[PDB]
Amino acid sequence: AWNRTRISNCVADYSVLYNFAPFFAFKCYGVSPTKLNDLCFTNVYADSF
């Protein structure tokens, strides 16, 4: 029943997901993390499992 959440017109404040929401399992496939500051997302979707 997952939700395709669409995000647009914001900024990639992703460092909070490391410690502010301290989720442990963080595997980025295709685009390794810590580079997520420009030319990052165009049609970003989020799936909740």
């Binding site: 442990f24 963080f26 993390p33 810590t34």
Partner: protein
């Protein structure tokens, strides 16, 4: 001295709490990482808070 869910970050080209704050392995690492449990020698009943 690490936790249980902590050996994973110990590899070349790996990132995480250890690689960002504690210790960084080179991507060109030539060696052996060896680990074993240390309950009877690195734990305390109330917590080995050392």
């Amino acid at each position: 001295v690490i936790k249980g869910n902590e050996v994973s970050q110990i590899a070349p080209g790996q990132t995480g709490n250890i690689a960002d704050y504690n210790y960084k392995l080179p991507d060109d690492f030539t060696g052996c990482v060896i680990a074993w449990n240390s309950n009877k020698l690195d734990s305390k009943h109330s917590g080995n808070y050392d």
